[PDB]
Amino acid sequence: ALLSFERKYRVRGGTLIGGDLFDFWVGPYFVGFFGVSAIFFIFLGVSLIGYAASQGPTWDPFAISINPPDLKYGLGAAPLLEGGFWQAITVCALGAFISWMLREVEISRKLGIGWHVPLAFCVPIFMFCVLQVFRPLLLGSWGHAFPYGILSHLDWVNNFGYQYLNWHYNPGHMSSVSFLFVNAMALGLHGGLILSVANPGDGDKVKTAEHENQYFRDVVGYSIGALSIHRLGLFLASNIFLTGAFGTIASGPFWTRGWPEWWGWWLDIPFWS
Amino acid sequence: ADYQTIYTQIQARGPHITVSGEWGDNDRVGKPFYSYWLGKIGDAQIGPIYLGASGIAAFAFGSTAILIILFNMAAEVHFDPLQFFRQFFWLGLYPPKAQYGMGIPPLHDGGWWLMAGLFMTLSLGSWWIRVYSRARALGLGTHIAWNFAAAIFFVLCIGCIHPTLVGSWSEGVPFGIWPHIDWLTAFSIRYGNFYYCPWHGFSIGFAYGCGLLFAAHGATILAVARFGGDREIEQITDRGTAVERAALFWRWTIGFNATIESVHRWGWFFSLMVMVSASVGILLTGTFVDNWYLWCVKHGAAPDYPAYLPATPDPASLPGAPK
Amino acid sequence: MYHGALAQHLDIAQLVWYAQWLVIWTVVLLYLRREDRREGYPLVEELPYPKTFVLPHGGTVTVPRRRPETRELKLAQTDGFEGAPLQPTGNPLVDAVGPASYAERAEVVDATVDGKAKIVPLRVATDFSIAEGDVDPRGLPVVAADGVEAGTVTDLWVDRSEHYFRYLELSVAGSARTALIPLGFCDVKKDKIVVTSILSEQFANVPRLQSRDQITLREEDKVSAYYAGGLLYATPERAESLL
Amino acid sequence: CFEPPPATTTQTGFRGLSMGEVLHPATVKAKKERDAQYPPALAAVKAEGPPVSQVYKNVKVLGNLTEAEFLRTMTAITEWVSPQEGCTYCHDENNLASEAKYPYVVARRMLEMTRAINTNWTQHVAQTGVTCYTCHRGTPLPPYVRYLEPTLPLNNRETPTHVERVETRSGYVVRLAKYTAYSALNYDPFTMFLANDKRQVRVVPQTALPLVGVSRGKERRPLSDAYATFALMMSISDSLGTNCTFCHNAQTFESWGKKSTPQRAIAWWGIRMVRDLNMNYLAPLNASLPASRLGRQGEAPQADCRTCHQGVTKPLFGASRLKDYPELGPIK
Ligand code: BCB
Ligand code: BCB
Ligand code: BCB
Numbered sequence A: 001a002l003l004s005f006e007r008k009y010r011v012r013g014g015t016l017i018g019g020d021l022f023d024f025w026v027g028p029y030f031v032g033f034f035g036v037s038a039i040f041f042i043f044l045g046v047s048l049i050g051y052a053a054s055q056g057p058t059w060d061p062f063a064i065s066i067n068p069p070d071l072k073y074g075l076g077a078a079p080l081l082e083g084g085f086w087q088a089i090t091v092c093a094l095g096a097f098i099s100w101m102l103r104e105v106e107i108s109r110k111l112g113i114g115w116h117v118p119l120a121f122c123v124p125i126f127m128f129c130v131l132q133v134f135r136p137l138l139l140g141s142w143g144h145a146f147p148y149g150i151l152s153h154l155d156w157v158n159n160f161g162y163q164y165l166n167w168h169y170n171p172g173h174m175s176s177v178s179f180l181f182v183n184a185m186a187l188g189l190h191g192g193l194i195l196s197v198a199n200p201g202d203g204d205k206v207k208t209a210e211h212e213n214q215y216f217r218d219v220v221g222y223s224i225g226a227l228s229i230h231r232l233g234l235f236l237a238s239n240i241f242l243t244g245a246f247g248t249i250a251s252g253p254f255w256t257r258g259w260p261e262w263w264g265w266w267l268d269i270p271f272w273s
Numbered sequence B: 001a002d003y004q005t006i007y008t009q010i011q012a013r014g015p016h017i018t019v020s021g022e023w024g025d026n027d028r029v030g031k032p033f034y035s036y037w038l039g040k041i042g043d044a045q046i047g048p049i050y051l052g053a054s055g056i057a058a059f060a061f062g063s064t065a066i067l068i069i070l071f072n073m074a075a076e077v078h079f080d081p082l083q084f085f086r087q088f089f090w091l092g093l094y095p096p097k098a099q100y101g102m103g104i105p106p107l108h109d110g111g112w113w114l115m116a117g118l119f120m121t122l123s124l125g126s127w128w129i130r131v132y133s134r135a136r137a138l139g140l141g142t143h144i145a146w147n148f149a150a151a152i153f154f155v156l157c158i159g160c161i162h163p164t165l166v167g168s169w170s171e172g173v174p175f176g177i178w179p180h181i182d183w184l185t186a187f188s189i190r191y192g193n194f195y196y197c198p199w200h201g202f203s204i205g206f207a208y209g210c211g212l213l214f215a216a217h218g219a220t221i222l223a224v225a226r227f228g229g230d231r232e233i234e235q236i237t238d239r240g241t242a243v244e245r246a247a248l249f250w251r252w253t254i255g256f257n258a259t260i261e262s263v264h265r266w267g268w269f270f271s272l273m274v275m276v277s278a279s280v281g282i283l284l285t286g287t288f289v290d291n292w293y294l295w296c297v298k299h300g301a302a303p304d305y306p307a308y309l310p311a312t313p314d315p316a317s318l319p320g321a322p323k
Numbered sequence C: 001m002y003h004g005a006l007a008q009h010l011d012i013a014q015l016v017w018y019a020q021w022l023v024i025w026t027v028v029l030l031y032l033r034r035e036d037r038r039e040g041y042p043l044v045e046e047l048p049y050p051k052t053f054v055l056p057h058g059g060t061v062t063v064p065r066r067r068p069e070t071r072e073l074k075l076a077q078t079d080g081f082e083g084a085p086l087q088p089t090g091n092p093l094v095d096a097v098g099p100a101s102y103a104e105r106a107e108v109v110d111a112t113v114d115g116k117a118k119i120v121p122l123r124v125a126t127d128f129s130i131a132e133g134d135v136d137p138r139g140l141p142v143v144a145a146d147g148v149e150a151g152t153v154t155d156l157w158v159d160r161s162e163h164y165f166r167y168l169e170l171s172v173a174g175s176a177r178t179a180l181i182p183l184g185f186c187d188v189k190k191d192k193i194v195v196t197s198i199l200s201e202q203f204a205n206v207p208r209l210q211s212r213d214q215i216t217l218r219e220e221d222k223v224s225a226y227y228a229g230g231l232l233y234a235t236p237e238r239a240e241s242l243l
Numbered sequence D: 001c002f003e004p005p006p007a008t009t010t011q012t013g014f015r016g017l018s019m020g021e022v023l024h025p026a027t028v029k030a031k032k033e034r035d036a037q038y039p040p041a042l043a044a045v046k047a048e049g050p051p052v053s054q055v056y057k058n059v060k061v062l063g064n065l066t067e068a069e070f071l072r073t074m075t076a077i078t079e080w081v082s083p084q085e086g087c088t089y090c091h092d093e094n095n096l097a098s099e100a101k102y103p104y105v106v107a108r109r110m111l112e113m114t115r116a117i118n119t120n121w122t123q124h125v126a127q128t129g130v131t132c133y134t135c136h137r138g139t140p141l142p143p144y145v146r147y148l149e150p151t152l153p154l155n156n157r158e159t160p161t162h163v164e165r166v167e168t169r170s171g172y173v174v175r176l177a178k179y180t181a182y183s184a185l186n187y188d189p190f191t192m193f194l195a196n197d198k199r200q201v202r203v204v205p206q207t208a209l210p211l212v213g214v215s216r217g218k219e220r221r222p223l224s225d226a227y228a229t230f231a232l233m234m235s236i237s238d239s240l241g242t243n244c245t246f247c248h249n250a251q252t253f254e255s256w257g258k259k260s261t262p263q264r265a266i267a268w269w270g271i272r273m274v275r276d277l278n279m280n281y282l283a284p285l286n287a288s289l290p291a292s293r294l295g296r297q298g299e300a301p302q303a304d305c306r307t308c309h310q311g312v313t314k315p316l317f318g319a320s321r322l323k324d325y326p327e328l329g330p331i332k
């Protein structure tokens, strides 16, 4: 039921609101008020997908899609069948996420550590807001959002991208894609370095923090430092959306043409034209 | 509110450290210096850097490949230095356009490309040897090298294994900024929307995972910095309150958790697979699949939508329409 | 005829797709998830063959640790529910419980690669200094959450392996004793040091080191734990709900 | 660097697919004012009278029209083609029946060409129809033509820079980029796909698995072909001032049925229509044109999608003169 070092941390407190009423554990999971609200908003969003999933033509989990309304419905309520479920689902999704986020603040305060995780978890929840709320509002319709299907939400992304002819030329995207590669690149370095110091091989002795630093100095001429790389990651990770978002929200509201032609500001400067 | 996790408030300066390898202690070159500003967000000490044979080899072949590319770029704009700086992104050294099978193509059409890539491939190989050797030399594991190899193997897959397997160098990736990006659309369209290749999906979901994992892992290590949670080796071999407060944070949120060592085994894995799935996807492409969308339509996966505008017959089927 | 098709309605691509899923879940369930169970297991109130680490400066240590002694926890059950929280019996900070808790780390000093003590004060570290530009806190007055002056900084404790300042030593006024704090609790100003984590009255009860010029792993927790414990136990308002 | 909101959007696909046009209103308008300059139809005139093949000396194409109706075609033509220069641009001022000046013989063949578009290509041009104005827009040499190489600017009423000039080799890729909507796709899709019918635009296989005997070695179409088809579409896209979802579902570019829109089939007939004008009507006019008009390979200027569409999905936003000038087709 508990980890061999866990009982000494299970103390009352940390709760943002609710007091003693919700401050308890069910299994390994912590509850709190936000753990209840999450459960409420999960169940309400899960049960309302399932309703929509039955009214559809198929139950094959890859194919299923619960799409938003047509462009004619604007920002108004759309019929339950004809997009209304999708709107219903959105609210429940955002409700749980925020509740999943805030919960982690309660867990953080009880353990007496930083709030860095839930504060790192907002960066996704924000990028989810960029797509399903901020951009549709900036284009006039909820019918610009991505549909909730496993294979189908790709088809949206594909058509979204090809609407501006060649989405790779997008400079926000270029930014965003680079941080994904570099963050994926950065992890295998850090994972690998930590593993390579603790698991050298054979009957070889474990090595020290100086060994880490020497390796990357030797190999690449520079070593960032233990604590720093973890600040580097969270940054590398975060900027996958923080910069991406800007590449998404401009496509339509602030830019209507193709994205390659955007680079005519560089290209068409008079004194090298 | 821990301001140390935001930046280094006070900076210690001292005499430089040197962990002696089993060899190449005499191949460390240069005097180390200290950037005060770097030292706020990282470690102040820049340099020195190890040389060695493999290192110089990764420069001599790496330069040679770069010198071959830039020459053919300069060619493209008739050697006009201003129209080099202007158009650079658009310039490129291309694989053959004409189908020659695998027979070595002419220098004017893909010959300089194939040769640019050889010298890239030798450079990539030389570095790997450095990434492997510097590990062993300092009594370290080879975990870094093997992940790097997986990423080398993805370049080899898209560089020269897949053209081989299908038998046409034309399939290779160009050199250049926009050009090697443009390849991504050509490739996908030719093999039927990569959004319908399962191993793209794996590739994306591991890369996305790497985002989440480092984000989450970074947040956890900074979050527990007050308990010296950055000291990850000596947290493995003598568990401190740091990684007690970590594991519990997660165990109460998502129900389970890792160790301070194993969570670095989750990242390592998740990075690795990004390249393994990416390699797997490619090796399948063109050899055993041709249109990934119709592969999904056959195996009843691909989703379907009704008609907004009226269903449009292929005019190439109508009686008496031209070719 | 097609390349890649096989008997029945089956093609090479279809078969590797299963293989991909099985290797994945093999690795997750049968490796990574067992490597997660080396610490804290077995459970209290599918395990791996234990792993030994041969230490850099002599000895070995198989994990997880079983200590020859079990420490007494001055806490008390709230309710008869299986997963009911625990309220402190005694003074929770000095007891070291909840967020004031410490791990049973070795009573050994952390060690540089060559052998020397890793975490030591600048009075010991003669070859270390503060980089020109940054503030020298030695002699500034540290001021608590209540706004009272709780002492004066008297030294810094550098990490010699990474060249990183990890602690701040301050003489507690009235008590005639020094006490360490982690920099992570210290807003470093030009003229003072703000510690919102604990009240002035509490600094006196910070865990005492065994030796003046060196600090054991367990001592680094104890001290670190104390201040983190204060964040919820400084006043009686800090434990309840915010709104 | 950017364009301010609001933005005009439409829907060409099932809700939630992100298929549709995105138009900047202040560009949409700029296009309308330009195309609104289209001179209105000259009032219909006396039907009765003898045919002009009897009346006039040299009338090989518009014989069946009565003189009054004949001269109305001759004013209208001059409005569309050469208004600033008037009738004398084609005709000898003393002798109207003379074929001294080269824009006469060229006009005759044009006159036939225009009747051919409206009669043998309604699968594309519909009931909207094409006139002399759709391409010329008030000038003898149309704004948007195409030689056997790229040239800048795309509008030939704007003075080209030295690098934009076709003699200058350094600007080559930039000439090629602006035809492909600024891409670095190293291919010329006009001279490949529209200047004749020697090439096949479709590259995607139409089966999951690779067909034996064409999926290895020298039996394969190189990847280049894919590049080139994309090149052409970027230019089609830019030519009409729209995007790929206006004619495709990006899910599957190769598939028709639900996955394409009626506009795509219409787009398809454009390709065959543009091919049929370039080979049989425009390229051969190099024997009738002076060298100041020909390219560096002696080729006569030819047309692409942009020649008629000039940035809009329908030329002149569906402006028609089909009924007003029936003598320009469709011919029974
Ligand atoms: C129309 C465009 C499509 C496309 C076409 C495409 C293709 C053709 C391929 C991918 C691939 C991939 N795509 Mg993908 N794609 C991806 C993401 C990805 C990656 C996860 C994956 C691997 C590529 C990579 O990591 O290279 C970055 C890392 C690289 C390239 C390795 C470099 C490491 C190397 C050791 C370093 C060398 C640097 C040297 C120092 C340089 C020296 C050079 C000198 C000598 C000149 C996302 C997240 C999306 C979204 C969200 O829309 C997407 C959409 C699309 N892709 C569209 C469907 N994509 C690859 C894949 O997974 O195949 C199935 C792939 O082959
Ligand atoms: C035509 C297709 C193109 C395209 C179209 C495209 C578009 C339209 C957009 C992107 C975007 C992006 N593209 Mg893509 N792209 C990418 C990569 C990327 C991403 C880095 C970036 C950001 C994605 C994002 O916002 O996720 C969002 C993911 C989120 C928000 C995750 C939400 C998680 C949520 C909080 C939690 C959910 C919880 C679950 C319900 C819990 C389940 C419970 C269970 C487990 C118990 C690569 C690497 C490539 C390559 C290699 O070719 C590529 C090619 C292309 N993209 C094609 C050229 N791309 C985005 C961008 O940044 O644009 C500039 C974007 O908007
Ligand atoms: C422009 C950016 C878009 C994009 C573009 C994109 C591309 C190009 C590809 C994906 C793919 C995927 N995306 Mg997607 N995406 C997904 C989820 C997914 C997964 C189904 C899959 C694998 C990614 C992964 O492993 O991540 C890392 C996280 C991991 C590994 C943790 C485990 C999470 C688990 C796999 C998620 C399962 C979700 C289920 C649908 C269940 C939903 C909850 C139910 C039970 C109520 C969610 C939940 C959201 C939300 C909530 O916004 C989202 C938004 C977007 N995606 C944007 C709209 N996505 C890949 C795929 O193959 O899809 C078919 C893929 O290739």
Ligand SMILES: C/C=C1/c2cc3[nH]c4c(c3C)C(=O)[C@H](C(=O)OC)c4c3nc(cc4[nH]c(cc(n2)[C@@H]1C)c(C(C)=O)c4C)[C@@H](C)[C@@H]3CCC(=O)OC/C=C(\C)CCC[C@H](C)CCC[C@H](C)CCCC(C)C
Binding pocket: A038, A041, A042, A043, A045, A046, A089, A092, A093, A094, A096, A097, A100, A104, A117, A118, A120, A121, A123, A124, A148, A149, A150, A153, A237, A238, A239, A240, A241, B208, B209, B210, B211, B212, B213, B215, B216, B219, B253, B254
């Ligand atoms: C750069 C920043 C990165 C990042 C960062 C972090 N990520 C975190 C944290 C941090 C710091 C945590 O604190 C938190 C966590 O706990 O760690 C495991 C978390 C989490 N990251 C998850 C998913 C995830 N991260 C993604 C991406 C990144 N993460 C990027 C890369 C992606 C992508 C890319 O697709 C996915 C799918 C969940 C596992 C978890 C929240 C679940 C939840 O909120 O619980 C409660 C919610 C549920 C249990 C289900 C909710 C069902 C709703 C109501 C109905 C569904 C509607 C929905 C719209 C349907 C769409 C499906 C359709 C597309 C098919």
Ligand SMILES: CC(C)=CCC/C(C)=C/CC/C(C)=C/CC/C(C)=C/CC/C(C)=C/CC/C(C)=C/CC/C(C)=C/CC1=C(C)C(=O)c2ccccc2C1=O
Binding pocket: A026, A027, A029, A030, A031, A035, A036, A038, A039, A042, B212, B213, B216, B217, B218, B220, B221, B243, B246, B247, B250, B253, B254, B255, B256, B257, B258, B259, B260, B263, B266
């Ligand atoms: C039964 C019931 C109704 C209870 C009510 C209470 C309640 C509200 C329960 C919540 C119910 C719900 C919705 C639970 C869902 C739980 C979730 C979010 C499940 C999804 C988990 C997934 C798929 C995560 C993907 C990320 C991933 C690959 C994780 C595996 C690796 C792990 C565990 C990383 C976490 C982890 C990280 C990131 C470290 O850095 C670290 C550092 C040092 C020590 C340990 C760790 C550590 O464990």
Ligand code: HEC
Binding pocket: D056, D057, D058, D059, D060, D061, D062, D063, D071, D074, D075, D077, D078, D081, D082, D086, D087, D088, D089, D090, D091, D096, D097, D098, D103, D104, D105, D107, D108, D109, D111
């Ligand atoms: C070139 C663009 C022309 C302009 C401008 C004008 N005309 Fe024309 N003309 C043109 C052609 C190709 C022909 C032969 C038509 C045919 O169907 O074969 C003609 C002929 C005439 C004639 C008949 C001359 C004769 O056969 O004796 C007349 C009287 C005539 N055109 C008059 C005319 C006027 C008045 C114009 C300006 C107002 C004018 N034309 C313009 C080509 C072109």
Ligand code: HEC
Binding pocket: D077, D081, D090, D103, D104, D106, D107, D108, D110, D111, D112, D114, D130, D131, D132, D133, D134, D135, D136, D140, D141, D142, D145, D282, D289, D293, D300, D301, D302, D303, D307, D308
């Ligand atoms: C596009 C589909 C066109 C339509 C409709 C008409 N013309 Fe045309 N014209 C077109 C091309 C590609 C060219 C060659 C370029 C050039 O100007 O040389 C032309 C040219 C002419 C000319 C010659 C102008 C000159 O070179 O001085 C004339 C006199 C002309 N065209 C007349 C003309 C008439 C009478 C038309 C309707 C009956 C007509 N054009 C339609 C393209 C197109």
Ligand code: HEC
Binding pocket: A162, A165, B189, D201, D202, D203, D204, D205, D229, D230, D233, D234, D236, D237, D240, D242, D243, D244, D245, D246, D247, D248, D253, D254, D255, D263, D264, D265, D267, D268, D269, D271
């Ligand atoms: C209508 C106006 C179109 C727009 C906008 C785009 N394309 Fe298109 N496409 C169109 C036609 C009429 C055809 C068939 C032409 C023929 O003669 O066969 C195509 C075909 C393609 C293909 C090849 C499909 C196949 O069968 O393999 C591709 C890959 C393609 N188109 C891509 C594409 C892109 C990337 C576009 C935006 C830049 C785009 N198309 C726009 C008509 C139209």
Ligand code: HEC
Binding pocket: D117, D124, D125, D126, D127, D128, D129, D130, D134, D236, D240, D263, D264, D266, D267, D268, D270, D271, D274, D303, D304, D305, D306, D307, D308, D309, D313, D314, D315, D318
């Ligand atoms: C002039 C001679 C044209 C050339 C050259 C091309 N097109 Fe065209 N197009 C033209 C007209 C007069 C019309 C109106 C007919 C109508 O449908 O109302 C069109 C129409 C289209 C459309 C349909 C637009 C819609 O329904 O909203 C498309 C998709 C189209 N044309 C595409 C297209 C392409 C791809 C061309 C080059 C290959 C092309 N057109 C050439 C006139 C002319």
Ligand SMILES: [Fe+2]
Binding pocket: A190, A194, A230, B217, B221, B232, B264
């Ligand atoms: Fe770590």
